[PDB]
Amino acid sequence: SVKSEYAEAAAVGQEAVAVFNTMKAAFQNGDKEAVAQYLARLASLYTRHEELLNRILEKARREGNKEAVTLMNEFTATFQTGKSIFNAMVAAFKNGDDDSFESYLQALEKVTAKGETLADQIAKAL
């Protein structure tokens, strides 16, 4: 069902949170080789999450689940903010700009946390 597909999408999201937190520790410790690998892994996870989310929104639309569509439109917009900040973080890493990396890292944490009440709201609406 779309609800089990959203639970699968939620788990992939949690996997990104887990990897993100081990990447943050690695960054703080200066282990740039680990950071590079974690950033690649996070890219894959975010790409996968985004794909699952679009499939869930499209299905909600085909099902005429207006409330779910509203919430998913808001959530996917927030997800794109996160993606843009993530890509800026990756660029800051490439450039060796640790001050920008620190900034972007904090911002991505705030975007992800704020989206969680909505994320929980979607689970109930599908």
Q: Site residues (CB under 6 A) for ligand BZX? A: 13, 16, 46, 49, 78-79, 82, 111-112, 115, 119
- Least distance between ligand BZX and beta carbon 23 (Å): 13
CA 56 to chain centre: 15
Burial label for 14, CB within 10 Å (0-12, 13-18, 19+), is exposed
Judge whether 126 and 9 are in contact, CB under 8 Å.
no
Query: What are residue 80's phi and psi, to 5 degrees?
Result: -70, -35
Residue whose CB is nearest to ligand BZX in the complex, by number: 82
- Residue 25 or 118: the one with the smaller Cβ distance to ligand BZX is 118
- Residue 17 or 34: the one with the smaller Cβ distance to ligand BZX is 17
- Least distance between ligand BZX and beta carbon 42 (Å): 9
- Least distance between ligand BZX and beta carbon 49 (Å): 6
Separation CA 108–CA 80 (nearest Å): 11
- Residue 49 or 59: the one with the smaller Cβ distance to ligand BZX is 49
Q: Which of 8, 7, 23, 14 is nearest to 90 (CA)?
A: 23
- Least distance between ligand BZX and beta carbon 13 (Å): 6
- Residue 65 or 76: the one with the smaller Cβ distance to ligand BZX is 76
As given in the structure block, the two tokens for residue 126 are: 């599908």
